[PDB]
Structure 1
Amino acid sequence: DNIQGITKPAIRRLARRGGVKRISGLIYEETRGVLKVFLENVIRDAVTYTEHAKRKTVTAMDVVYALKRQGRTLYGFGG
């Protein structure tokens, strides 16, 4: 059990960057679901890329390639 590592004030901070004033108290348990699901896809690709190169270490380029295949491009990590 480590999804609880995403503490409540962390969710509050993430919400505050978005520009929301009031947070319901039951939001967190559902929001931790979204973090649970959106993260279960890139890793699906990230390990798989790793498994193509006969290597068992997840390099910083595999996650970039996964996020590119999904439609979210990021800069600054060797893209």
Structure 2
Amino acid sequence: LRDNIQGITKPAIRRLARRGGVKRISGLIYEETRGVLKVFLENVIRDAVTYTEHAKRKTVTAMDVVYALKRQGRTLYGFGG
């Protein structure tokens, strides 16, 4: 597993922008969005991994991700708790 950040695809970012109401997109937006998503995922995953390690488990459950998002201030519904 290496250089997986390119999996965030240019049409995917365009679709997300269109859902966000963006009409025209510059060519340099995609790298910035990739970096932002990388940072956000890093933070959430670090918190979730800490939660799982506390429970003496090795499988990251959806409850741990929900708790991590709630701690970050981004409480998510529909995945328990």
For the criterion TM > 0.5, the same-fold answer is: yes
Q: How many residue pairs get matched?
A: 79
State TM-score, norm by structure 2: 0.94
Measured in 2, the distance between the counterparts of 1:3 and 1:9 equals 14
Aligned to 2:35: 33
**C-alpha RMSD of matched pairs (Å):** 0.6
Superimposed CA distance per residue, residues 39-67 of structure 1 (whole angstroms, 9 cap, x where no aligned partner): 11011110111001111100000000000
Task: Give 5+ residue unaligned stretches, structure 1.
Answer: none
Measured in 2, the distance between the counterparts of 1:8 and 1:30 equals 12
Task: Give 5+ residue unaligned stretches, structure 2.
Answer: none
State TM-score, norm by structure 1: 0.97
Measured in 2, the distance between the counterparts of 1:62 and 1:25 equals 36
Aligned to 2:14: 12
SS of structure 2 residue aligned to 1:4: helix
SS of structure 1 residue aligned to 2:76: coil
